[PDB]
Write a protein that binds this ligand. Structure first.
Ligand SMILES: [Zn+2]
Ligand SMILES: [Zn+2]
Length: 586
């Protein structure tokens, strides 16, 4: 028995990706960014992913590796094999710069030069195609598959003229064909003469950017339930001669018994059912009523919590990210971990082409897979956004540790040119004139009076930052630290402060043995800093629910959640949301 599934249908927020599995082995195609988030919400059976097949060197195709290697490291999968362009493995020697030279997992890379494979089923054949190089994969069970990627119009003529597909067209039998091509090039005129020759008995699956659907379900559920409390700070999310069907979430297929689709576990959203389920929790409705009665008691500088999790994400909190915007047309992103662009898109919708046009700089605290992975996704999409608005490309300033430049240089030299979108400021120069003038540009582009940095605790070369505006409001971002005096010394009297509750109280021994902070320690550090408001972020990977309360939870403390919005005028009412939230996650 063998099936097939569509992990991602190719929406704007997530690239295309396919998942094949049987009794013996399991496979994966185009492991793009955010793929590891999926396959865990849906509870798909990993633990046997011997092979990964990649159709291009672009980031949207190869972005999910760094997380999938670690996921396989968990559960101890002995080996994995990559297949794709010859430029692989040089991408991989670049990942080891920041991912740490892990030796528990041994892996191999197969270039396009290997034609046969032939291992225990389905006998992958690799088919290189040039325009500048893509590889198409066709598989033959001991039925047949076809998986093709056609990013541009220039690939149509090579694709339709290849001789490899001609011994399966007409009469072999190719059960399916999967296309991942933009809607613009899907029709052409030379095209549709190639997918025709397979005969109408075959069905074609397409994963264009027009594949509108929701791949998460649970995030939307929790967000609507939260919006039940107070809508302003919890906005709702937003998303031929032969037969042809458009791709959806997972879906399903069968090849041997009969070639039939199956909607066994498609995902659907039912806001009203979510609301009625929510209203049955113990004392949730009463708490919301009390809060609404209590509510009877500027908006420009605001912060959006795109991500608040730690370690590999777990379907409720994504890897840490936080957007700070000083005006409707000037912004700043802070940490840029994995999945940032997906969160931004699923938060704003069609305004992303304008929000990306306001970014002025980014700030990565340190080099961990949860803090800098998603930057190239922001850069590439910012390029397109600038193109759509009819303005030239202006490099996006980035403040980062000096060790980040090595990974970017390796990627630039080995996979694709991405370095020309970036202007780098070494974070060391912003703590206690070529880079000085770039610093002046950073300060002037946001009207910030000063930008400050400090070497915080945790691993080597980890930093925090403080931002102070000409209007006088001051916000300090800690990053990952254990209670240290670098904060406070960085400048007290901050209007807002963000700190990490990576652990619950009573685990100070773990907070000492490993460099992370408990909630009580975080609140203590914030109160010593004498900040007007204290905000908790970067939560523990164990629970992902509301934290544990302690006596020191003063009026100045708050609990951050994913996709949440905040303004300086919301502080007097923010502490009053605790009861209904605690009733929600009972
Ligand atoms: Zn780290
Ligand atoms: Zn961290």
């Amino acid at each position: 028995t063998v099936y097939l599934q569509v992990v991602a249908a190719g929406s704007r927020d997530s690239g295309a990706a396919l998942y094949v599995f049987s009794e013996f082995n399991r496979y994966l195609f185009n492991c793009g960014e955010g793929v590891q988030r999926l396959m865990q919400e849906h509870k798909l059976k990993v633990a046997r992913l011997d092979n990964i097949f990649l159709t291009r060197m672009h980031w949207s195709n190869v972005g999910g590796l760094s997380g999938m290697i670690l996921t396989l490291k968990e559960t101890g999968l002995p080996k994995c094999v990559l297949s794709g362009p010859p430029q692989l493995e040089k991408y991989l020697e670049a990942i080891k710069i920041f991912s740490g030279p892990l030796k528990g997992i041994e892996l191999a890379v197969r270039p396009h030069s290997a034609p046969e494979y032939e291992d225990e089923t389905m006998t992958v054949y690799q088919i290189p195609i040039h325009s500048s190089l893509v590889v198409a994969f066709i598989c033959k069970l001991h039925a047949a598959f076809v998986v093709v990627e056609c990013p541009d119009e220039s690939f149509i003529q090579p694709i339709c003229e290849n001789a490899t597909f001609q011994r399966y067209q007409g009469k072999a039998p190719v059960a399916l064909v999967v296309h991942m091509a933009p809607a613009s090039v899907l029709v052409d005129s030379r095209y549709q003469q190639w997918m025709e020759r397979f005969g109408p008995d075959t069905q074609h699956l397409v994963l264009n950017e027009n594949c509108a659907s929701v791949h998460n379900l649970r995030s939307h559920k929790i967000q609507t339930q939260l919006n039940l409390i107070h809508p302003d700070i919890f906005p709702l999310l937003t998303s031929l001669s032969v037969p042809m069907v458009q791709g959806e979430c997972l879906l399903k297929y069968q090849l041997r018994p009969r070639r039939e689709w199956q909607r066994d576990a498609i995902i659907t959203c039912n806001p009203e059912e979510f609301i009625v389920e929510a209203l049955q929790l113990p004392n949730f409705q009463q708490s919301v009523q009390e809060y609404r009665r209590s509510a009877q008691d500027s908006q420009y500088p605001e912060i959006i919590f795109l991500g608040t999790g730690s370690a590999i994400p777990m379907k409720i909190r994504n890897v840490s990210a936080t957007l700070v915007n000083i005006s409707p047309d000037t912004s700043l992103l802070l940490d840029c971990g994995e999945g940032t662009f997906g969160q931004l898109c699923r938060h704003y919708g069609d305004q992303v082409d304008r929000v990306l046009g306001t970014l002025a700089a980014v700030f990565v605290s340190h080099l961990h897979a949860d803090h800098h992975t998603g930057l190239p996704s922001i850069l590439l999409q910012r390029e397109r956004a600038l193109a759509s608005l009819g303005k030239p490309l202006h490099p996006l300033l980035v403040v980062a540790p000096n060790q980040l430049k090595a990974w970017l240089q390796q990627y630039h030299n080995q996979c694709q040119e991405v370095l020309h979108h970036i202007s780098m400021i070494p974070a060391k120069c912003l703590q206690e004139p070529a880079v000085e003038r770039l610093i002046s540009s950073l300060l002037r582009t946001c009207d910030l009076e000063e930008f400050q940095t400090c070497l915080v605790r945790h691993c080597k070369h980890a930093f925090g930052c403080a931002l102070v505006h000409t209007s006088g409001w001051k916000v300090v971002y800690s990053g990952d630290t254990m209670p240290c005096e670098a904060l406070v010394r960085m400048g007290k009297d901050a209007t807002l402060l963000i700190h990490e509750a990576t652990l619950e109280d009573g685990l100070e021994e773990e907070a000492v043995e490993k460099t992370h902070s408990t909630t009580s320690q975080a609140i203590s550090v914030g109160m010593r800093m004498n900040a007007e408001f204290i905000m908790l972020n970067h939560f523990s990977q164990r629970y992902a629910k509301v934290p544990l309360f302690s006596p020191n939870f003063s009026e100045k403390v708050g609990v951050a959640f994913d996709h949440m919005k905040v303004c300086f005028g919301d502080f007097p009412t923010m502490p009053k949301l605790i009861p209904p939230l605690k009733a929600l996650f009972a």
